[PDB]
């Protein structure tokens, strides 16, 4: 996260991390046994971690749970990034408490102008590298589909929306992918891609969770 702030410790309990020898992506806990992330965050073996604030310094309450099933969307396109969404089933159900908790699924698409909260352990530099230990947060508005398509001509698909600032300075970044975009108590988005991080007229692009609401149901049904 570039141009953001350190999250409060006991405030994003749905925020998770994806791990293969190192933290590589984020995710969101949507039920005791399922995580939503980005398809481009696929690996054959994944360890989910829950209840983290500092990813280095454990305060006692973190959970480490191997992923059992890892399921990319079938119409995921690795080139265009259409349908960048993935579901992970935890090998054990998460223990739900103060510090691990699910985020509600959305009841309607993203609405332009709305303020969202994007979060993760992504790079905090637009240039060079500072991967932070503490979870970062950014408050940012949904942009209009027009602003989104002008910043990225031809590249915006039905499955994508832009959140952020066309002035730049503030954006999501590498290691943020797969992580949450929450507007008004619902997961509206999944960190996907962008041109650079915090560049002018190049806002982050995010997957619309709302599109996959029936696929998420049907996927959990089929596998549980």
């Amino acid at each position: 996260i570039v141009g953001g702030y350190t999250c409060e410790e006991n405030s994003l309990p749905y925020q998770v991390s994806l791990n293969s020898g190192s933290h590589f992506c984020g995710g969101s806990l949507i039920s005791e046994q399922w995580v939503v992330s980005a398809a481009h965050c696929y690996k054959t073996r994944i360890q989910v971690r829950l209840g983290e604030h500092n990813i280095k310094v454990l305060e006692g309450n973190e959970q480490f749970i191997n992923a059992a099933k890892i399921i990319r969307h079938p119409k995921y396109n690795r080139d265009t990034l259409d349908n960048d969404i993935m579901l992970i089933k935890l090998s054990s159900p998460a223990v739900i408490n103060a510090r691990v908790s699910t985020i509600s699924l959305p009841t309607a698409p993203p609405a332009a102008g709305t303020e969202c909260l994007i979060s993760g352990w992504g790079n905090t530099l637009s240039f060079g590298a500072d991967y932070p230990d503490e979870l970062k947060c950014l408050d940012a508005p949904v942009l209009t589909q027009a602003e989104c398509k002008a910043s990225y001509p031809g590249k915006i698909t039905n499955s994508m929306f832009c959140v952020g600032f066309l002035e730049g300075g503030k954006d999501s970044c590498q290691r943020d992918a797969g992580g949450p975009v929450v507007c008004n108590g619902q997961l509206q988005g999944v960190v996907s891609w962008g041109h650079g991080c915090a560049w002018k007229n190049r806002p982050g692009v995010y997957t619309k969770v709302y599109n996959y609401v029936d696929w998420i149901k049907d996927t959990i049904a089929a596998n549980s």
Binding site: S22, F24, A38, H40, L81, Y131, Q174, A177, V191, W193
Partner: protein
């Protein structure tokens, strides 16, 4: 020896953090970089000996 070995490393648009290897022509050997998870250029390898075996003295 390939001329794509001369390109700087390319993180790309995606927001994963994935360690990959690229040939640094000026240093004369392979180094690590952060790959975002999509749209890899050619100077992007899954390990050092991999990289050095195709771009080693490029």
């Amino acid at each position: 020896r390939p001329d794509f070995c001369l390109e700087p490393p390319y993180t790309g648009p995606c927001k994963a953090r994935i360690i990959r290897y690229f040939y640094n022509a000026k240093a004369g050997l392979c180094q690590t970089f952060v790959y975002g998870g999509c749209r890899a250029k050619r100077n992007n390898f899954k390990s050092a000996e991999d990289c050095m075996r195709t771009c080693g003295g490029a």
